[PDB]
Structures are given as C-alpha cells and as structure tokens.
Design an enzyme around this catalytic site. Structure first.
Site, PDB file in Angstrom:
ATOM      1  N   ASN A  48      11.129 -36.379  -7.825  1.00  0.00           N
ATOM      2  CA  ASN A  48      10.378 -37.194  -8.786  1.00  0.00           C
ATOM      3  C   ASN A  48      10.790 -38.662  -8.643  1.00  0.00           C
ATOM      4  O   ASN A  48      11.970 -39.001  -8.514  1.00  0.00           O
ATOM      5  CB  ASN A  48      10.753 -36.652 -10.163  1.00  0.00           C
ATOM      6  N   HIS A  59       5.584 -36.917  -9.486  1.00  0.00           N
ATOM      7  CA  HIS A  59       6.442 -35.771  -9.797  1.00  0.00           C
ATOM      8  C   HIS A  59       7.096 -35.275  -8.505  1.00  0.00           C
ATOM      9  O   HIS A  59       6.678 -35.617  -7.399  1.00  0.00           O
ATOM     10  CB  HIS A  59       5.595 -34.679 -10.426  1.00  0.00           C
ATOM     11  N   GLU A  61       6.830 -32.433  -7.012  1.00  0.00           N
ATOM     12  CA  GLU A  61       5.891 -31.718  -6.158  1.00  0.00           C
ATOM     13  C   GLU A  61       4.947 -32.683  -5.465  1.00  0.00           C
ATOM     14  O   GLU A  61       4.564 -32.486  -4.318  1.00  0.00           O
ATOM     15  CB  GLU A  61       5.087 -30.677  -6.978  1.00  0.00           C
ATOM     16  N   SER A  86       9.377 -25.272 -12.816  1.00  0.00           N
ATOM     17  CA  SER A  86       8.029 -24.712 -12.885  1.00  0.00           C
ATOM     18  C   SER A  86       7.010 -25.846 -13.042  1.00  0.00           C
ATOM     19  O   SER A  86       7.257 -26.818 -13.812  1.00  0.00           O
ATOM     20  CB  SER A  86       7.959 -23.744 -14.057  1.00  0.00           C
ATOM     21  N   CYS A  88       4.066 -28.562 -13.764  1.00  0.00           N
ATOM     22  CA  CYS A  88       3.157 -28.997 -14.822  1.00  0.00           C
ATOM     23  C   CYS A  88       1.717 -28.754 -14.374  1.00  0.00           C
ATOM     24  O   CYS A  88       1.420 -28.310 -13.262  1.00  0.00           O
ATOM     25  CB  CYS A  88       3.389 -30.460 -15.153  1.00  0.00           C
ATOM     26  N   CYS A  91       0.776 -30.790 -11.051  1.00  0.00           N
ATOM     27  CA  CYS A  91       1.345 -30.275  -9.803  1.00  0.00           C
ATOM     28  C   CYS A  91       0.745 -28.909  -9.477  1.00  0.00           C
ATOM     29  O   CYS A  91       0.484 -28.585  -8.298  1.00  0.00           O
ATOM     30  CB  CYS A  91       2.870 -30.225  -9.935  1.00  0.00           C
ATOM     31  N   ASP A 152       7.710 -38.072 -18.826  1.00  0.00           N
ATOM     32  CA  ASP A 152       7.404 -37.494 -17.536  1.00  0.00           C
ATOM     33  C   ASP A 152       6.410 -36.342 -17.636  1.00  0.00           C
ATOM     34  O   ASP A 152       5.704 -36.047 -16.666  1.00  0.00           O
ATOM     35  CB  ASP A 152       8.706 -37.024 -16.889  1.00  0.00           C
TER      36      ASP A 152
END
Ligand SMILES: O=C1NC=C[C@@H](O)N1
Ligand SMILES: O=C1NC=C[C@@H](O)N1
Ligand SMILES: [Zn+2]
Ligand SMILES: [Zn+2]
EC number: 3.5.4.1
Lengths: 166, 164
Positions: A48, A59, A61, A86, A88, A91, A152
């Site tokens: 991130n 982020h 990902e 995990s 969001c 992503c 975030d």
C-alpha cells in the site's frame, strides 16, 4: 490448484515482506504479489502506497498489479494474487476485472469486506492462510493509527455512534 | 437528487474533455471527474493512463480518484463520480469502497460490465446519459486499436468468441 497452491507459501512470504517494508516506510502494512501458476514466477510485488505516494488508489493489491506492468489479458488467467489482508471492494473488483482465478489471503480478522464472498460468487477461489505475522502487524497499525486506517478503507468515522456503543 | 443532478452536464463535459486529452496523448479515451454534490466543486479529474504511464490500474475512474488526492471517508459520501464509459468491475469496486453514492455514465454502448448492476445492488445510483461525444471517441479508439482496448479490460481478442 493442486499445482497452483504449491506456490502459496512463497507468495504469502513475499506479500508479508512487502507489508513489513511498507510498515517500515510509515505506511499501511499491507503487501502483495502476483505469481504465474505455470512456473511460480513472480510477475510483481507491492505494498500500500497511500502514505508514501499520497495515493487514494494504491492499496497493496493495486500496487502489486501496477508493479507487474501492462500484461496481455491471458496472462492473468493463470495467476494467483497474494494479499496479506482480505481485499476491500476495490481490490476485489481488480481481481474480477482481470480474471485472476485465485486470491490467497494472509488474514481476514482485522478486516473483511463483502468482496471476500463476492469473489467466490463470481467464480474465483479464495484461501485464507491465517498468517500470524500479517495479523500482528495490521493489528498494531489499526490500534495505533485508526484515523489513517479508516481513511484507507473509505469509512466515515462516526464518533457519536461509537460513544453510544461503548 | 436535484442538488446533485444539477451538476451532471458540467461533470460529463469535464469527463469528456479528459477523455479527449487522453486521446491526444495516445491513450484510451476514457475520462472522469469527482464533484461535491453540495456546491458543485470539482475535487479532481482524470483519464486512463495505461499508455501514458504503462499502467495496469489507472483506468479513467481510478486516475480521477488518484488525482483528487487523499480524502477522509466522509468527503466521498456526498459526491458524484462522472465517467465517460460504464465502469468495469475494478472501477465499480472503487466507487463501492469509497461509498460514492452516485455514478453518472457517459455511455454503455461500447462497454458494460456486471458492475453497472452491482452498483445498484449495493445501493448506489447509476445514471446513463448516452452522450454521443463519448460514444464516438470510444468507437474510434476501439476501431483503430482493438488489441489495446482489450488489454485495458484484461481480455484477449479471439475469433471463437464472435464466432458463436
Ligand atoms: O491496501 C489495502 N487496504 C485496505 C484493504 C485491502 O484491499 N488492501
Ligand atoms: O478506463 C477505463 N477502462 C475500461 C473501463 C472503465 O472502467 N474505465
Ligand atoms: Zn483494497
Ligand atoms: Zn475500470
């Protein structure tokens, strides 16, 4: 995948290294990598970048995908995306748009969105590793910097509700 | 609703100009802007940066959000995201993650994903304005550079697909 899952320890170890580096940099400690399931090659790795780059979209990902560069669409169809946390809804949507078939998740205790289930509804495989290194680093950030954490994940801070709840 | 929709012509003109600028730069002509519904202020505008920056994530909507800078979660809750093209699953996810309540779409003739409906399932408002300028610029790009367009939505051109 019986063959694709063989890379899962490698992928989560790289994703955690990225999270720990982001932590060191004063950022949100969420890391990732994208692996080609055919040969275990690392297509890219990232973390991130909200603090490091003043970024509303990087982020872990997204930064991972950005770092792989432009790729032909077919490449993603046989990859695994590793993420320490995990995903969001954003992503999740990136994994879906590119057709990445597998998402391997470090932990879903500090955070989970509706995307974890939506991935599976849309035909993607999710595996949660329950990696304690990931959980510890993320819990430290959320505990120490909740204002930054809510930023975030796009959550409005509702202190009146929290004061009534507690 | 009235206070928000009063900005919809302004927002799509900005998004279209961003698309046209991306076209001039050799990129995919998809543009956006994010407007505060209370007063019509433009928080940011952007366009797809795949070709300009070698970027797999800077779709028009993503670049628009990036160009608004870091914002607290509350800011997004009374905004409209304008996009010249109906959003893919990734940009749909960004709108959902930030809680942007309204998405105004130039056109969904050249492209639509499952995200258009998923936005509504998740409680967001979607308005498609069928802007002829947007349809024509996107059709032009797709006709000249089809492989590049398919790379932008992560799909490979295959004759089998159109051949039943
Ligand atoms: O970097 C990240 N922030 C929040 C959740 C996850 O998608 N990744
Ligand atoms: O830039 C973009 N490319 C494809 C679809 C849309 O989400 N925006
Ligand atoms: Zn995310
Ligand atoms: Zn998109």
């Amino acid at each position: 995948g019986g063959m694709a899952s063989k890379w899962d320890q490698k992928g989560m170890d790289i994703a955690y290294e990225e999270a720990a580096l982001g932590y060191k940099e004063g950022g949100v400690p969420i890391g990732g990598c994208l692996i080609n399931n055919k040969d275990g090659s690392v297509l890219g790795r990232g973390h991130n970048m909200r603090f490091q780059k003043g970024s509303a979209t990087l982020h872990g990902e997204i930064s991972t995908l950005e770092n792989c560069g432009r790729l032909e669409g077919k490449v993603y169809k046989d990859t695994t995306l590793y993420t320490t946390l995990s995903p969001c809804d954003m992503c999740t949507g990136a994994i879906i748009m590119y057709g990445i078939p597998r998402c391997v998740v470090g932990e879903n205790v500090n955070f989970k969105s509706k995307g974890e289930k939506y991935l599976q509804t849309r035909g993607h495989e999710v595996v949660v590793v329950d990696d304690e290194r990931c959980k510890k680093i993320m819990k430290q950030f959320i505990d120490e910097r909740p204002q930054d954490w809510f930023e975030d994940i796009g959550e409005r801070i509702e202190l009146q509700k929290q004061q009534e709840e507690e």
